[PDB]
Amino acid sequence: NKDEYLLNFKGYNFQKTLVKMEVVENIENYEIRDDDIFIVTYPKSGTIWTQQILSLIYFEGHRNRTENIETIDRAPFFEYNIHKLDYAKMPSPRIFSSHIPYYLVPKGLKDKKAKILYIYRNPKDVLISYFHFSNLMLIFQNPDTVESFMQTFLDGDVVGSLWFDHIRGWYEHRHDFNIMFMSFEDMKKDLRSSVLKICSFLEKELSEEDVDAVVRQATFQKMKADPRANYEHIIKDELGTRNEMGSFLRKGVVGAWKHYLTVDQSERFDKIFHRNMKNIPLKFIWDI
Numbered sequence: 001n002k003d004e005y006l007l008n009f010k011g012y013n014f015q016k017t018l019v020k021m022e023v024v025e026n027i028e029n030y031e032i033r034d035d036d037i038f039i040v041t042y043p044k045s046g047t048i049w050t051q052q053i054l055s056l057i058y059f060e061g062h063r064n065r066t067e068n069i070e071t072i073d074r075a076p077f078f079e080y081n082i083h084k085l086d087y088a089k090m091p092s093p094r095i096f097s098s099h100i101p102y103y104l105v106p107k108g109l110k111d112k113k114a115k116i117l118y119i120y121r122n123p124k125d126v127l128i129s130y131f132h133f134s135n136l137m138l139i140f141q142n143p144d145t146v147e148s149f150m151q152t153f154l155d156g157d158v159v160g161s162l163w164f165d166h167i168r169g170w171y172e173h174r175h176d177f178n179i180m181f182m183s184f185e186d187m188k189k190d191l192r193s194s195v196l197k198i199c200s201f202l203e204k205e206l207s208e209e210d211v212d213a214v215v216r217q218a219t220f221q222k223m224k225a226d227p228r229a230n231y232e233h234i235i236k237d238e239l240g241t242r243n244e245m246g247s248f249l250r251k252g253v254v255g256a257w258k259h260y261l262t263v264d265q266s267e268r269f270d271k272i273f274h275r276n277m278k279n280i281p282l283k284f285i286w287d288i
């Protein structure tokens with residue numbers, strides 16, 4: 001029942017229907033250009049939000065609305081090329097999106113010239129967002145309850161494997177990469193400062209009004225209304241939805257998990273989280 005959803009490779013779970021083992025086996029020797037940009041996330045942590053943000057920053061047609069092209073074609077998923085784009089002929093600087101773990105990266109990323117932006121989010125909101133997204137999307141197995149999906153999640157039996165392993169392998173191996181770390185919650189709290197830090201790390205210059213436009217079009221409620229970024233057509237017509245009521249930009253709030261997890265589930269999660277993360281000095285926000 002569960003083999004047809006996950007493709008395991010070196011202890012990591014790819015989405016089986018979207019990638020083939022040929023491309024996975026080819027990832028190690030993939031040509032990396034010295035100005036490539038990689039958005040690396042664990043699923044449901046702000047991937048397409050960051051796609052939108054980087055598209056607004058790097059493609060002035062998208063920012064000025066002279067071009068009307070979906071953000072997935074600006075920063076396509078490195079391992080999920082659902083639009084069948086020839087990544088080799090895409091113009092530099094290429095932007096890619098990916099959920100792969102540190103040890104599955106193309107060795108060209110270890111030359112530390114291509115840049116990596118790692119976006120993370122508190123794992124309880126990640127859990128609940130993944131729960132709803134799996135209920136909605138056909139490419140994922142349909143979970144029954146919150147308790148059962150939490151078990152499935154802490155077991156790593158989802159696309160992206162175990163959240164703790166993902167974030168740990170990326171952080172505990174910072175120095176193999178030219179990489180920055182930023183949190184969904186920080187982007188939620190100060191969008192403008194986060195955009196500025198992204199531009200600094202990517203050493204991309206922007207005028208002040210351009211940054212105003214980036215913040216304006218990357219805000220949740222405005223981006224949900226932007227069909228170039230809200231992924232509505234992609235999930236309805238290409239990837240397929242079980243119902244037709246849910247959306248990729250569901251709520252986008254921090255702290256919503258408190259309405260789904262009982263105190264017992266939360267405390268068990270906290271024990272696992274402390275065991276896995278007590279040494280990692282990343283700031284974590286859990287509410288508002």
Ligand SMILES: Nc1ncnc2c1ncn2[C@@H]1O[C@H](COP(=O)(O)O)[C@@H](OP(=O)(O)O)[C@H]1O
Pocket residue numbers: 041042043044045046047048049125128129130132188218219220221223248249250251252253
């Ligand atoms: N501009 C934006 N601003 C704030 N939150 C956003 C956002 N775009 C997406 N989000 C939220 O990012 C989550 C999906 O992230 P990803 O792209 O990694 O799959 C969703 O969380 P929620 O399910 O809590 O709403 C989505 O609502």
Ligand SMILES: Nc1cccc2ccccc12
Pocket residue numbers: 015018043044047080099159239
């Ligand atoms: N975040 C994601 C993980 C795996 C597959 C996806 C497909 C489409 C959009 C987003 C995806």
